Amino acid sequence: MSFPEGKDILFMGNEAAKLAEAFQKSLR
Amino acid sequence: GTTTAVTPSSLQQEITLLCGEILYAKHADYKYAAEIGIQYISTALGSERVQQILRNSGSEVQVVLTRTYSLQMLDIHGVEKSWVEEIDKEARKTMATLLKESSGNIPQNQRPSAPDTPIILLCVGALIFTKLASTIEVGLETTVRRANRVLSDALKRYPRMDIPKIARSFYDLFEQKVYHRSLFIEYGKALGSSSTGSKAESLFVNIFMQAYGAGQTMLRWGVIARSSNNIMLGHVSVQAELKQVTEVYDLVREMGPESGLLHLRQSPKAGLLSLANCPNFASVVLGNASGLGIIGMYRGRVPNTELFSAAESYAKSLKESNKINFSSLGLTDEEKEAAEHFL
């Protein structure tokens, strides 16, 4: 089992934030 | 100060017999069964090496050597003589009765003196130990059910073995004598290296070796969430935890598999293994696991239920459209079976 760095696990950036926000919104 | 039993290597055969006697008969009370298992470990590693190990675990407990007496019995420090004598009496009574019914003809591997009886006993202990190592809470009865399958072959040889009561004895010992977790680690490491590859040793080592991964479960699930491309890993409240998520994975990266034991050892850094400082990340990690169908019966905390549900929905939709690469995730076999219903 090879663990990556935290920055390679999270999706960083404005675009990634907007994507997650939109999906959450679609769930009502 | 506090004291605990060790048993000299010169009494290895006698402690072996006592372990066998625990398995061999239906006993009323198994309170000290786990301690007898520990005594076998002490003969394996050496009593003075045990004192070193305990000292190094941060304990000032002083070891007290087992002696013998005749009514030949073992006098084990902190173990009531009435208990040892009653285990022995009940085993010997059972053996006399069964020996006569079989006209004196009983195979060695059904007797309490069989050399793998301490290892069998310790396999029950090993299952409790790996239960303890996990950052995921499970009920004792669940572990007992697992012991029944794992030790099915031992149960054919020893059909009076009381797994639930033996299991409870190890459960209590690891809760009450925390330093014996460190002793168990050294035995498992030692046996991993010296194993003859016998059935009993192989089983013990295979159970014991699972403790490292068990401690890392939530971090491994975290990697799985990324390999699943769960987009909730991009939520602003999760991105904000980047330094904490970094601290968590820096820990396992730098330490290697040994870091998996920090939970078991009650180390100051154990909280990292349960993602204690990054609750939003944890919620997405757990939700993703739930959505994939690998989370089992999780009764633990879900810090952010909205994030959990979103992460769960997303994983679930990828799964239902066959857009999850289950081979590439790094699932355990049991997780694979749970998620896909084939192995």
Author numbering:
A (entry chain B): 1 to 28
B (entry chain A): 30 to 100, 112 to 383
The authors write:
To stabilize monomeric full-length N0 we fused the N-terminal domain of P to N, a strategy that has seen success with nucleoproteins from other viruses. We obtained crystals of RNA-free HMPV N in a monomeric state and bound to a P peptide at 1.9 Å resolution by adding trace amounts of trypsin to prune flexible loops and promote crystallization. Ile9, Leu10 and Phe11 of P occupy key positions and insert into this hydrophobic groove. The P peptide wraps around the CTD and residues 12–28 form an alpha helix that lies atop N. This helix is initiated at Gly12 and pinned to the CTD through an aromatic side-to-face interaction of Phe23 with Tyr354 of N, both residues belonging to the so-called mir motif which is conserved within Pneumovirinae. We observed that the binding site of the P peptide overlaps with the binding sites of the NTD- and CTD-arms. In the RNA-free state, Arg260 and Trp261 contact Glu375, while Arg186 forms a salt-bridge with Asp373 of the CTD-arm.
HMPV (Paramyxoviridae, subfamily Pneumovirinae) is a leading cause of serious respiratory tract infections in children, the elderly, and immunocompromised individuals. In all members of the Mononegavirales, the RNA genome is packaged in the form of a nucleocapsid, a ribonucleoprotein complex consisting of polymerized viral nucleoproteins (N) and RNA. Besides protecting the viral genome from host nucleases, the nucleocapsid serves as the template for transcription by the viral RNA-dependent RNA polymerase L. Nucleocapsid assembly necessitates a pool of monomeric, RNA-free N, termed N0, which is kept in an unassembled state through an interaction with an N-terminal portion of the polymerase cofactor P, until delivered to the sites of viral RNA synthesis. In conclusion, the reported structures of a paramyxoviral N protein reveal two distinct conformational states, N bound either to the polymerase cofactor P or to RNA.
